[PDB]
Design an enzyme around this catalytic site. Sequence first.
Site, PDB file in Angstrom:
ATOM      1  N   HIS A  74      -3.769   1.126  -3.909  1.00 23.15           N
ATOM      2  CA  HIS A  74      -4.570  -0.121  -4.056  1.00 23.15           C
ATOM      3  C   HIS A  74      -4.026  -1.217  -3.131  1.00 23.15           C
ATOM      4  CE1 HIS A  74      -1.291  -0.780  -7.109  1.00 23.15           C
ATOM      5  NE2 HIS A  74      -1.456  -2.064  -6.719  1.00 23.15           N
ATOM      6  N   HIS A  93       3.518  -2.083  -0.808  1.00 21.48           N
ATOM      7  CA  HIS A  93       4.646  -2.924  -1.274  1.00 21.48           C
ATOM      8  C   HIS A  93       5.825  -2.781  -0.306  1.00 21.48           C
ATOM      9  CE1 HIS A  93       3.148  -2.650  -5.765  1.00 21.48           C
ATOM     10  NE2 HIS A  93       2.332  -3.406  -4.978  1.00 21.48           N
ATOM     11  N   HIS A 124       4.237  -8.238  -1.255  1.00 21.83           N
ATOM     12  CA  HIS A 124       2.955  -7.584  -0.953  1.00 21.83           C
ATOM     13  C   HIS A 124       1.897  -8.643  -0.640  1.00 21.83           C
ATOM     14  CE1 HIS A 124       2.789  -8.379  -5.350  1.00 21.83           C
ATOM     15  NE2 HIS A 124       1.519  -8.642  -5.065  1.00 21.83           N
ATOM     16  N   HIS A 150      -2.496  -9.633  -0.981  1.00 21.48           N
ATOM     17  CA  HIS A 150      -3.882  -9.354  -1.405  1.00 21.48           C
ATOM     18  C   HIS A 150      -4.805  -9.866  -0.296  1.00 21.48           C
ATOM     19  CE1 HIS A 150      -2.664  -8.636  -5.757  1.00 21.48           C
ATOM     20  NE2 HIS A 150      -1.632  -9.368  -5.279  1.00 21.48           N
ATOM     21  N   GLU A 202      -6.198 -14.822  -3.945  1.00 18.07           N
ATOM     22  CA  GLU A 202      -6.377 -14.683  -5.413  1.00 18.07           C
ATOM     23  C   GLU A 202      -6.520 -16.090  -5.979  1.00 18.07           C
ATOM     24  OE1 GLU A 202      -5.398 -10.535  -6.918  1.00 18.07           O
ATOM     25  OE2 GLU A 202      -3.442 -11.549  -6.712  1.00 18.07           O
ATOM     26  N   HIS A 228       2.512 -12.640  -1.815  1.00 15.39           N
ATOM     27  CA  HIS A 228       3.254 -12.636  -3.111  1.00 15.39           C
ATOM     28  C   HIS A 228       4.684 -12.156  -2.875  1.00 15.39           C
ATOM     29  CE1 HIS A 228      -0.674 -12.477  -5.733  1.00 15.39           C
ATOM     30  NE2 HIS A 228      -0.409 -13.681  -5.172  1.00 15.39           N
ATOM     31  N   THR A 264      -1.551 -10.131 -11.326  1.00 14.75           N
ATOM     32  CA  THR A 264      -3.008 -10.187 -11.053  1.00 14.75           C
ATOM     33  C   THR A 264      -3.641  -8.802 -11.026  1.00 14.75           C
ATOM     34  OG1 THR A 264      -2.666 -10.148  -8.711  1.00 14.75           O
ATOM     35  CG2 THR A 264      -2.700 -12.327  -9.749  1.00 14.75           C
TER      36      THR A 264
END
Length: 256
Positions: free
Chosen positions: A60, A63, A90, A92, A102, A115, A195
């Site tokens: 998904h 990392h 990581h 998003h 996010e 993040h 999240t």
Amino acid sequence: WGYDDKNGPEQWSKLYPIANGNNQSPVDIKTSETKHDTSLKPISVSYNPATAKEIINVGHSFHVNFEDNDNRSVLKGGPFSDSYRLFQFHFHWGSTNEHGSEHTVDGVKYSAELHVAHWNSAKYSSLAEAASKADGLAVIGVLMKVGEANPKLQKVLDALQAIKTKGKRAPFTNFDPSTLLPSSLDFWTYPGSLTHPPLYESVTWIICKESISVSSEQLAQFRSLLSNVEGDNAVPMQHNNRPTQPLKGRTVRASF
Ligand SMILES: O=C([SeH])c1ccccc1
Ligand SMILES: [Zn+2]
């Protein structure tokens, strides 16, 4: 779980009821409703590039993991009396430049989000113990605005060609992720969650007011990572950003 229409953020509540909790993330930061808190100290990061360990395709997302056996790499200050140990970072991103962050500020959606994740090593003896505790995790969020290519993103993006498919991993060493952080560390803080599943309400969010840059082509490199295993039909990781969640009466504090 995933980010499909079938296994997606709208569905997560079926297997993870905490998805409809009181301390969920991300949120929309309304600047008119934030409380300036005079007691917030500056954020202090001190990271040792020798703690950088490994980059992993987790299906998904991807990392970057750090050795977390001691306090070579730590976050202090902000709203914390405890020192927090770096364990990973990581990103998003979204299907288009138009969304991808996010967190949002006054309704504005950025193109991606960094993040940088830390665990409370003053109080707990491992990530696995800390991960589910209210005060267990501290995560710096950096909104990423589409514009100029970000040369600090470079070592990270160059490594993705070795981890193209789900479960691939490769050494990733001698890197200080404080080099990705904005010049100003003026921040918002609120109590919230991971999240994605398992959505533990264990995170003190530190959201930088200053954005960092990312190019349209740098974003495409993220979306070119594959979620399938090697040999299967290629399935690009087009997006992995959760919609903003209700504050349910929490207060976002500003250091500035
Ligand atoms: O911060 C989020 Se979103 C998170 C997800 C996996 C590991 C650590 C933190
Ligand atoms: Zn995240």
